[PDB]
Amino acid sequence: PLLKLLPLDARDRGTQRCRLGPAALHALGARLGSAVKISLPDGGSCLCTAWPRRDGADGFVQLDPLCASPGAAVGASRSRRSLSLNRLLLVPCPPLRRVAVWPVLRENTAAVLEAAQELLRNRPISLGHVVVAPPGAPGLVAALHIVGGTPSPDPAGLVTPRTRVSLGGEPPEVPLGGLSEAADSLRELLRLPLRYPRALTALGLAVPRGVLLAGPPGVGKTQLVRAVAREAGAELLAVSAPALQGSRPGETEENVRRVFQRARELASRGPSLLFLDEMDALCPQRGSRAPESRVVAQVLTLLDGASGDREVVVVGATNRPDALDPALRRPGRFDREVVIGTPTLKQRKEILQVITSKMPISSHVDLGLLAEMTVGYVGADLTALCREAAMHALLHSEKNQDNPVIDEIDFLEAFKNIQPSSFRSVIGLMDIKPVDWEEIGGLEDVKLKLKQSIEWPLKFPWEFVRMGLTQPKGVLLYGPPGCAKTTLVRALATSCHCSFVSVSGADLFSPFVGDSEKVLSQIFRQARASTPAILFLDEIDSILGADVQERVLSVLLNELDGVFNRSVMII
Amino acid sequence: LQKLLRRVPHLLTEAELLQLANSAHGYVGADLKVLCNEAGLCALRRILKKQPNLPDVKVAGLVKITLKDFLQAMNDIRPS
Amino acid sequence: LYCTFYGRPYKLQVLRVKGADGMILG
Amino acid sequence: PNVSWSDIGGLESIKLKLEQAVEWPLKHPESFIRMGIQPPKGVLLYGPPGCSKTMIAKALANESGLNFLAIKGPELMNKYVGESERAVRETFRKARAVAPSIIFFDQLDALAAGNVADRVLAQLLTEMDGIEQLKDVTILAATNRPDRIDKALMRPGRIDRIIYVPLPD
Amino acid sequence: GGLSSQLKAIREIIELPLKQPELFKSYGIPAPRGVLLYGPPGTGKTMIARAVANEVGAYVSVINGPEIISKFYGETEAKLRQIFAEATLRHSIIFIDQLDALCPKREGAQNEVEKRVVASLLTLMDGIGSEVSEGQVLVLGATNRPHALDAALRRPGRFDKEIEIGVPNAQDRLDI
Ligand SMILES: Nc1ncnc2c1ncn2[C@@H]1O[C@H](COP(=O)(O)OP(=O)(O)OP(=O)(O)O)[C@@H](O)[C@H]1O
Ligand SMILES: Nc1ncnc2c1ncn2[C@@H]1O[C@H](COP(=O)(O)OP(=O)(O)OP(=O)(O)O)[C@@H](O)[C@H]1O
Ligand SMILES: Nc1ncnc2c1ncn2[C@@H]1O[C@H](COP(=O)(O)OP(=O)(O)OP(=O)(O)O)[C@@H](O)[C@H]1O
């Protein structure tokens, strides 16, 4: 005989009551309140008490799962499954003398023990079962796991007001490559404020607590912090807030201090991280609203406050790194920066090999040609290129549907109608192509003078200073157009094996560059960050404006002066 | 360093603080403090590699302050 | 059906009831 | 468009010179690596004035399957402040969208009012550099005077080959 | 008249789902949601929306553009939502026409019905993915100038497929 399943009423919610008809109670031979074990259709089982329906009609079953197998709360009845009667059993309940529970508490020992006695008072329970607290219950225990008992609750049993309750305990995604170089630069900072049970209170200070991530829009900045997240616990209150303000002056400064209040509340025995995103915050035509960045300043001040109290790490991600507040950048709230650049030719192949691994693409597909043809893209557009080449190989297809053959015909078809991302052709580009010294014909004496003033002072620094020779603090090369000045600088960077920050004048003509005093300060800071380095300013007459003229000269003249191997050469 | 801090135990605390003063020839005040940052939290490191895992309230009770962190802190901190 | 929403009387006419066993009316 | 080579006169030497840049990098790229040479990309035509140069560009697009998109010369400098820059980039997106296409740009000497000529030279240079690697899109330009052509547009990845179109013999 | 390549793509895109979502998860991709149609004004985008709803057969929910502009306060967040899953019910194709009304991108002006209706669509379309019960929601956006649709409305999961309906040629005007 088959019985239907119906959703429970508002009076059976959290009462552990099973509503049966009279013929099923005659067939089971049960009294009122006797224990019925229900073997569920989608695995697992539950334990309930038998109570009759008011209507007297037979053919229907309702059930409320409170004592359940873990992950077996499948008693929702949208599809209206039917249960057979062979799945309900009448189970004898001896009384118990000792239980063993493991509690799951909400976000001392005596209050937890008192809340366990109060939940489990006069109930039938079995072994390996979760007892779930009803909604609106007083106290702090959210769940209990049943571990053991001395009259052995394997065919279950009844807790009594005079039983004993004891506490034991035994509870038995895209990897994204290409950011490997910067993923561990993050850990050499943030691992030391994750192994802190007030040990750095005892011996030390506090490495910074205020990091900043920058990069082009599409290199996967938000997914990197979720990867460093899971990597070391943490609940990442990822407060984005692109428009959290309003018409009132600073009405969300009360709101962000409650955001910052639960940074402390969720700081006991566990890591936490405040993840401010899109600190972009557009540029209003008129003066930005006071509350907009004042609270920032509050966030600033608040942040600088986090130093006199319990110290919570803040990782911020912005898109365009310049035109921030200059009172951030000073030692404190925000002084350690990790820069994620546009991808090179090398790991763009390993960007592609991560995405190619999940899809069934056949072995007759190039990678180096797919890396080389895709110059100008970011990591978001390479996923959509591999999304679109899956679609035109499902779009057009055959009738067999057993061999997923994706070939080079529809990768080149999907290359055609995907537009490339902007905000790449700017700032400064390292890595270009290797040029040897033998490609430049003639000019033997100019090669000797360039070697004696920039490569010998950056490669052999002890023998330069012991012989008593000065380092020239910035050279200038001038001549007619067409006599290999840019080739001689690029041959010098290959033999030096150093970083190469190059700014040209044709980079500066783009309208996406914001006013270029702070692009010129961004170039000097990325240089002093990367160590032994060559800063190349090609076409300085276009940079200096052959007003904004006098302001540019000034940011340049002040940086040219204020500056075991160091120093930045300016060519 | 007499008024170094007078706290933060072990340290050197011998008569061979004269040679680091001789050594002393760069800048002060705000660089030397961060020498305490480059000797306080930089004296661990080597403790956490010789043992795999421990509660860090016992690592702070067994902290050792060495001579060898001072020479590398000269290379990391350049006063003026 | 009759309900008084803050003094205003409402007249409701029931056209169709669909219940928990899936059987609808006319 | 419908102009054949026989309507102009069958200019056989200018037929082979234009086919060496728009069809020979695709069909026979082995002969370029056999001789040790980079493949040319952009082609400038110079000569005496008239409508002779715009009919050769229409006749080249007729014999191969090739689509034609035309940008004028001194029209675009005289126009307004803003989205003539957007009209340049919407021409370049429509060339890559459909199929191997020829972008015809008109008189080049008029570009070479300090801020007027330079925001359009910036948008032209940052998008012609996007089709340096793509072999199916070719830029084709016609000018009257080879003297007042800017040397920024004469680098060996952007415009290489110079062909003289004479008065007929 | 004309558009024989581009309407055949719309029908093949609007038929594989609702019928066969097993083929999409056979290879490597989720079943997509956002079909964005655009063109110059006067081309046939609103007629090709009404053409799809006359053939395939579902509940079709049409939300207009210039009549959810003004209101009095934030009544969009009750109206949109109800509109969505309500259709969710008929397991359904959701039409949004004149997308540059509901959402601009005009930062200078900071309007009250502008800056958080963008959070009313990105956080609704990221939750309309019905993977608890494996439902199918298709959003067809039609706009006259998708030049000013935020940069955040082109991300995957959201509006992804963009089909261009351009000005007709001489062979197309013959068939018109
Ligand atoms: N190694 C990778 N590098 C870059 N992008 C990747 C990589 N692997 C996957 N992606 C793609 O990037 C997406 C992540 O986008 P994400 O939201 O993190 O961008 P974002 O850079 O934070 O954006 P925004 O600048 O708007 O804040 C993934 O869903 C995937 O499509
Ligand atoms: N001596 C030389 N040997 C070989 N190639 C040379 C020589 N001089 C110039 N070239 C070639 O000239 C071309 C242009 O050189 P490059 O752009 O480096 O310098 P430039 O014209 O002086 O630069 P700019 O105009 O920006 O000042 C390159 O293709 C280079 O190979
Ligand atoms: N391809 C076509 N064949 C026949 N009639 C057409 C065609 N395209 C448009 N029409 C005519 O245009 C009418 C609908 O206008 P249409 O769909 O072009 O709107 P629209 O002006 O493009 O809209 P929007 O203002 O949203 O940009 C049809 O009723 C019909 O009269």
Coordinates of C-alpha atoms and ligand atoms in Angstrom, one line a residue, chain E residues 1 42-47 144, ligand 3:
Chain E
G1 CA 13.5 40.5 -44.7
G42 CA 15.1 51.5 -37.1
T43 CA 16.6 48.0 -37.9
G44 CA 14.3 45.3 -36.6
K45 CA 15.4 44.4 -33.1
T46 CA 12.0 44.9 -31.4
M47 CA 10.2 42.9 -34.1
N144 CA 20.0 51.0 -29.5
Ligands
LIG3 N1 13.4 43.4 -41.8 C1 12.2 44.0 -41.8 N2 11.3 43.5 -42.7 C2 10.1 44.1 -42.8 N3 9.6 45.1 -42.0 C3 10.5 45.5 -41.1 C4 11.8 45.0 -41.0 N4 12.5 45.7 -40.0 C5 11.6 46.5 -39.5 N5 10.4 46.5 -40.1 C6 9.3 47.4 -39.8 O1 9.6 48.0 -38.6 C7 8.6 47.8 -37.6 C8 9.2 47.6 -36.2 O2 10.3 48.5 -36.0 P1 11.6 48.0 -35.5 O3 11.5 46.6 -35.0 O4 12.7 48.2 -36.6 O5 12.0 49.0 -34.3 P2 13.2 50.0 -34.0 O6 12.9 51.4 -34.6 O7 14.5 49.3 -34.5 O8 13.3 50.0 -32.5 P3 14.2 50.7 -31.3 O9 13.5 52.1 -31.1 O10 13.9 49.8 -30.1 O11 15.6 50.8 -31.7 C9 7.8 46.5 -38.1 O12 6.5 46.5 -37.7 C10 7.9 46.7 -39.6 O13 6.9 47.6 -40.1

